[PDB]
Amino acid sequence: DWVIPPISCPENEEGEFPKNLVQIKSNRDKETKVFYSITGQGADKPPVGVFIIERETGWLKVTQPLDREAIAKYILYSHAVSSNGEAVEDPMEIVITVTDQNDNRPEFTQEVFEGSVAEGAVPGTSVMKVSATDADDDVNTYNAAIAYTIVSQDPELPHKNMFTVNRDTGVISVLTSGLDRESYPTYTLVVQAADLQGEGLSTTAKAVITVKD
Amino acid sequence: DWVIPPISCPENEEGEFPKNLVQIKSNRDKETKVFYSITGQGADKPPVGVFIIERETGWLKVTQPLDREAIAKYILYSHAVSSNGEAVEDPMEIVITVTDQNDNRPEFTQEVFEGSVAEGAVPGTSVMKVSATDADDDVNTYNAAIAYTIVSQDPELPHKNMFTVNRDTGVISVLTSGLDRESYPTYTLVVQAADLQGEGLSTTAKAVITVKD
Ligand SMILES: [Ca+2]
Ligand SMILES: [Ca+2]
Ligand SMILES: [Ca+2]
Ligand SMILES: [Ca+2]
Ligand SMILES: [Ca+2]
Ligand SMILES: [Ca+2]
């Protein structure tokens, strides 16, 4: 069957407010003068006044930019009251969904990750995992699709690239041979996480790897 | 009962196109992949491509600025077809109404109106009528609500204001005494018509009045 989807409104809208969303209507507006109102969170309950309805025309409007990450869905109820003061409809549920924009940058779950690896570990050996989260919409967009990279390694010995990271999982592995605890007991890697599959907003953190016997 | 009003779109919209109007949906999109299309005048029939629908999301959009005075109402039908090629809904009627903007100036139905009046006619005597039309929406707005005025009179004798016009009807009447055929056999009046009850767009024409015995 054909059905009516929730009203959709993108977050972070700019320009002239308020903005029309949709017109609601009671077909009793034929017999009497009808006045429309809305109730619910976002209307008369917190956050108050985010949405309003024009009492005589039935035009539902949004008055401010929205934030999906604050509230992703609103449930309101419309009311219809004649000029003589009687409700001429049962209140009608109205659903509004807020659509996503890429406005949150990824964040590593810690500033410094620690791991260790045996000096004799064969190339390919998994050492540790770095992890980042992204508040944007991972279900319907790539705004939270994170790619992990290694930005730098200190020291750059015995080779510049002793390790590699899984672009999707943040698991760091031994890339080449030569780890040597006596010479270089510790490595500090700067790792990067970036959304839009690596092309978007980005953040960095450190991974400190202790070489063991 | 609560009912669904036609989609409303203001004429002469500016900025980024296309613009979203509303999202339609088949709840069979649960069982199979659904592809949406629209037919009708404004879609696949002239004017072609004014409205389109995004095949996978169901978002109906308008691609150009509209002109209420060209077309004030569109009737389209939406279709729903599975990826395997069967229609999964009966086509649904979709109505779009175009809302008015004050973009037509009034026009007198002729460039020169002619009338005559007996020189002895008492003040108040109705002489002639000027008439203007306005293509904008006279039902729902004041965009075609015309006010008539007299801009000038030639000659300005025996008095500057021998006549007056009904602001609403354009009927011109004798305002004062002194008309005298031998002295001033003819008057040329410039009359004005302006919408928004006199405050809006305006045009002028002439009224030529012959004084009779
Ligand atoms: Ca946000
Ligand atoms: Ca993001
Ligand atoms: Ca977001
Ligand atoms: Ca127009
Ligand atoms: Ca007009
Ligand atoms: Ca118009």
Curated annotation (Swiss-Prot), chains A, B:
Ca(2+) 3 binds at D134. It comes from Mus musculus. Cadherins are calcium-dependent cell adhesion proteins. They preferentially interact with themselves in a homophilic manner in connecting cells; cadherins may thus contribute to the sorting of heterogeneous cell types. CDH1 is involved in mechanisms regulating cell-cell adhesions, mobility and proliferation of epithelial cells. Promotes organization of radial actin fiber structure and cellular response to contractile forces, via its interaction with AMOTL2 which facilitates anchoring of radial actin fibers to CDH1 junction complexes at the cell membrane. Residues 1-108, 109-213 form the Cadherin domain. It is found in: Cell junction, Adherens junction; Cell membrane; Endosome; Golgi apparatus, trans-Golgi network. It comes from the Eukaryota. During apoptosis or with calcium influx, cleaved by a membrane-bound metalloproteinase (ADAM10), PS1/gamma-secretase and caspase-3. Processing by the metalloproteinase, induced by calcium influx, causes disruption of cell-cell adhesion and the subsequent release of beta-catenin into the cytoplasm. The residual membrane-tethered cleavage product is rapidly degraded via an intracellular proteolytic pathway. Cleavage by caspase-3 releases the cytoplasmic tail resulting in disintegration of the actin microfilament system. O-glycosylated. O-manosylated by TMTC1, TMTC2, TMTC3 or TMTC4. Disulfide bonds: none annotated. Homodimer; disulfide-linked. Component of an E-cadherin/ catenin adhesion complex composed of at least E-cadherin/CDH1, beta-catenin/CTNNB1 or gamma-catenin/JUP, and potentially alpha-catenin/CTNNA1; the complex is located to adherens junctions. Found in a complex composed of CDH1, RAP1A and PKP3; PKP3 acts as a scaffold protein within the complex, the complex is required for CDH1 localization to mature desmosome cell junctions. Interacts with the TRPV4 and CTNNB1 complex. Interacts with CTNND1. Three calcium ions are usually bound at the interface of each cadherin domain and strengthen the connections, imparting a strong curvature to the full-length ectodomain. Ca(2+) 1 binds at D103. This is Cadherin-1. Ca(2+) 2 binds at D103. Changing Q64E: Increased affinity for L.monocytogenes InlA. Greatly increased affinity.
